[PDB]
Design a protein around this ligand. Structure first.
Ligand code: NA
Length: 240
């Protein structure tokens, strides 16, 4: 997250860190959202590589013992069947991870609430991106979980020629694009939390930013629109 602020450690209890085994260690690669005690929602492109993955819930500082973490292996990966790794702009950048164990819920570990199917945010709706991704374009990962306020940019604006044009689809949500705050590498797969009728819900799964940089004016961060995939998510969970 570029231009973020440190999150309070109990603000976003559905945020997870997706990590891969790297020699004798584990390395953060992506975010995700805990949606059942044994299921995580992330981006498909985060699980393209043939790596060994684990999820960490209750994480705040990647590089220090928080006293709150639970570490769980990933047992099964279900990527959306229309996902094409040659074509992130086509959409379908979503995957569900079944965990090897069910995690225990507490003030640091909670299920993300998802929007009702078909819900579309009004332009300029209040949202936060969260994650441990790069804090500057071509920078380094944050140590502590970051948040940035990214108001939505509706489809009519986002798909206009000076924004994303045809690259953004109606199955996506765009947020930000002010040139100062954005998602960045390492934030992919994590949540966009939007305040609706008094309650934060996870409306987006972080999918892509510009190849010209993370925080680029009129290139808002692009998220998979969770409300387009409610039936898919429920179908996968019910059949696994
Ligand atoms: Na930690």
């Amino acid at each position: 997250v570029v231009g973020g602020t440190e999150a309070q450690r109990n603000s976003w209890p559905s945020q997870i860190s997706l990590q891969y085994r790297s020699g004798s260690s584990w390395a953060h690669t992506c975010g995700g959202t805990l949606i059942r005690q044994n299921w995580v929602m992330t981006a498909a492109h985060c699980v393209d590589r043939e790596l060994t993955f684990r999820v960490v819930v209750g994480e705040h500082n990647l590089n220090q013992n928080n006293g709150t973490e639970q570490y769980v292996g990933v047992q099964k990966i279900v990527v959306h069947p229309y996902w094409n790794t040659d074509d992130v702009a086509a959409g379908y950048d979503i995957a569900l991870l079944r965990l090897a164990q069910s995690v225990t819920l507490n003030s640091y570990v909670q299920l993300g609430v998802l929007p009702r199917a078909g819900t579309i945010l009004a332009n300029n709706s209040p949202c936060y991106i969260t994650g441990w991704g790069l804090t500057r374009t071509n920078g380094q990962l944050a140590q502590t979980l970051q948040q940035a306020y990214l108001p939505t940019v509706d489809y009519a604006i986002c798909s206009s020629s000076s924004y994303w044009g045809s690259t953004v689809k109606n199955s996506m949500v765009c947020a930000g694009g002010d040139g100062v705050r954005s998602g960045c590498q390492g934030d992919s797969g994590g949540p966009l939390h939007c305040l609706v009728n008094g309650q934060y819900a996870v409306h987006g799964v972080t999918s892509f930013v510009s190849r010209l940089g993370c925080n680029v004016t009129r290139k808002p961060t692009v998220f998979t629109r969770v409300s387009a995939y409610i039936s898919w998510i429920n179908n996968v969970i019910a059949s696994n």
